[PDB]
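Follow-up to my post from last week.
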Amino acid sequence: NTSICRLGFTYDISQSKNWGNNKPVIKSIIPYSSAEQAGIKKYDVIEEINGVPVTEVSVDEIPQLLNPAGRNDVLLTISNLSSPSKQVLVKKDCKKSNAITEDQLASAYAMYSLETTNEQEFVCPFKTTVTSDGVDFGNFKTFAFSTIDENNRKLETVINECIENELTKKGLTVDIAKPDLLIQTFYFFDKNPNYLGANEKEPTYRYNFSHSKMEKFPFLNYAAAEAEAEYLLQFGIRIIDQKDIPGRVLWECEANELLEDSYRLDEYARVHVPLMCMQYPYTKYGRNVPFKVSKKTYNYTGISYDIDKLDQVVDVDRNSPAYAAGIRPRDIIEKIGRHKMDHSAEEFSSAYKRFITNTMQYRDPKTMFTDANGFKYCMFWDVFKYPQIADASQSSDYLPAFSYLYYFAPYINPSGNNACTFNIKRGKTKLEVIIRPTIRSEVTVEIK
Amino acid sequence: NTSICRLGFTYDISQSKNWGNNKPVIKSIIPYSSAEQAGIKKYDVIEEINGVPVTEVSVDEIPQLLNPAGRNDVLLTISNLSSPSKQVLVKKDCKKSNAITEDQLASAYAMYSLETTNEQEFVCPFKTTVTSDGVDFGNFKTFAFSTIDENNRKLETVINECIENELTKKGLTVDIAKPDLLIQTFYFFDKNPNYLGANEKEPTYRYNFSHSKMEKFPFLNYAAAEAEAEYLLQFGIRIIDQKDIPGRVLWECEANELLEDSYRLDEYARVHVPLMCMQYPYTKYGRNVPFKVSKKTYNYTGISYDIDKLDQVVDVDRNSPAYAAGIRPRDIIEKIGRHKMDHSAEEFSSAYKRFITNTMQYRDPKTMFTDANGFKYCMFWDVFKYPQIADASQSSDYLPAFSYLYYFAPYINPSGNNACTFNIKRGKTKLEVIIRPTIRSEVTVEIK
Ligand SMILES: [Mg+2]
Ligand SMILES: [Mg+2]
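User reply:
Got it. Predicted complex:
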């Protein structure tokens, strides 16, 4: 009955002295949102809301000002590394309070396709250090790389090409003549002397000059885990100021990795330069960076369902396959493919739980992982058991009406036809429409 | 027959770009040596040897030039943080090839007194980072502390007083008006969010943008040991240039400690400021600093013994208690106290091994430690068993003639008399002299 609204981005009230201090800083953009389409990008700084500067208003009233009651389109004054000022009109993303979207259902029925829809977390051993001077990083618009060590030309060119792509994507530009910043990289790869050719918790002893004796200290002595590494890897990025206080290191990120086998620094840089630079210009973690990867792929039609009476269309997105097919709100879905829809939420929930139970045998334990929400037994399907999974997935006992969301996968829909049949009834008139869905694919890589 | 010689210090050919590059840098001074008395100090840079600059000569011929054949006194041109040039005449420390000194014997019979004579190693979680500019740290002679945060005045005053003592000992001087350097400290103490109220090796998963998927990486995932810590401690020293390139951080040392209980940052600074500053100006370890503590206390008389015929005096140090008592080389020691000396080296070695075996029962297992040379079962004597240790230590079966080296300890000599009786025989004339020894005490704290 009441309509809920959202802005297509997540943000922080920045505590960083060098990037949009005590202002909203965008952390992530919601895919397929209006904020995305309007051109809002990660690490953007909200300077003003609807003409009022964010400094001239309390921190507690920023969420209300960003989601006004009467207004629908929020005018934003943005700053980033591309420009110091920019006007952006962000349209709101609204839905009915009782609407269940295909995005929500793709997440609820994710175990049909863990291969495409999951969340995972990881932590990187990055030490990120910035200048103690409260200089805004937005003052530096251009960069150049420091002189290449000819002994390592091949490697240094790969590293600098990775950093160049990351920084040009941020809105920074190369100027070899008079750069605002100089980029410097340092790296190391060699054997660990503390490796004993072997793979408990020890006490911490230190010398105390004040008492002229060795003493036990209540610190964790991790020195035994260090011995487990044969090799040591170091990789760092140094961003040196050339204009405000020349020679001052503005930002430095150093990765220190404990290695089991031999590893290539070029391969290491290719993977980690993009993860390391996610904290330039917005640094919030100094020692161990937490990341969250959320991936999702589903068949999109544009239909929203009633949270209570699920066989009822509550809305149809404006430029969607279901709209183009002629589906309209208040329609009643008789069936999707060969599966009836006149079931309760608990009928669907129980039937789904039965499917996961009865197909645990077709999962691959070599792929077992713990997802971001703490679930320990995530497994992909076994590649030699897809025909058996597809058959089990389509058993009427498991109420597979919503399995259409994953009809692009051969472990759900073996037939070479992603087009879904929707049998609707508006009043007493019964129609059958074939909806070829569009595939909504999305990956969000966010610093927690 | 041939006399061996040494210089009273250990050194490196420095690989540091900011401190005596490709020149000898003194690491440690040998206590009671001529180099010590001449005023050679740790981290001194040998600029010239006997008038010849160390740059104008090969690295391979520096040890020979430092220990000449014909010459006995080596004239050194030194540089440090106190002065850019200084003339130092270092006398050599010589001994006969067949001489066994009381210093050597104190180390060989150390298990009489582990409490006073042992070696231990420890590693500190210090990250030490220096400027990539090859500026000599000797260009900066004065310092001042940066403005105190009034919210933490009590703590910041303790920290700065510790750093002030360390740097003034190095030869640096305070100048609040126009300092060459500004010292800045940063610190943090709070609970670990990753602590689960609990006290295996996990795989490393990271996101690879090049392949748009999570991947296993051959890196050690230590994230489980991080969870064991309730609290996190950070403590850092920042040395900022004010004259050459103002604002440039020359040297920075950051300690990151994983804590079991609550801990005071003032107490932490008091202990670690002296360990952290041992790498200013000579930094050779960037990430995990290895230290070695060598302590020794023995009764010194000045007598040197023959490695083969041990009851024969091969030398008597010039200003020693044995010299003052009238002991002279070629004398024959009949007995020390009530213990005869006419035994072989294996007679003494076996008798000593029997004593350690038979007194293992009087050791305190609560004190068990692994020494620097890798011995796992080092234990001090049990404080309630000293009378029994003293009796066992003086049993003629264990040939305790050399136990006089530890006669100042009540677990060896219960009587309140540190004066030792030496019964000698020169030719056929037999004399008894009472030697009150001097107590040689020494602690060496060195970066490995
Ligand atoms: Mg190997
Ligand atoms: Mg506790």
